[PDB]
Design a protein around this ligand. Structure first.
Ligand SMILES: [Zn+2]
Ligand SMILES: [Zn+2]
Ligand SMILES: [Zn+2]
Length: 64
């Protein structure tokens, strides 16, 4: 069976990981659907609001 986002096999990696062979773990939802972590990450990042700082208008980014 295949990841719902990238439509590549679960038993293999997502498109980012094919060339350089990085680890590409799977994740599961309570709804029972499985995705490559990398794929669902792109999804969740795009769908989530970009938060701002509680105290100013700037996008919230952690200082590293
Ligand atoms: Zn995928
Ligand atoms: Zn991957
Ligand atoms: Zn689902």
């Amino acid at each position: 069976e295949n990841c719902g986002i990238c439509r590549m096999a679960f038993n293999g990696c997502c498109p980012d990981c094919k060339v350089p062979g990085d680890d590409c773990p799977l994740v599961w939802g309570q709804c029972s659907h499985c995705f490559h972590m990398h794929c669902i990450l792109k999804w969740l990042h795009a769908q989530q609001v970009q938060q701002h700082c509680p105290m100013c208008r700037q996008e919230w980014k952690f200082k590293e």
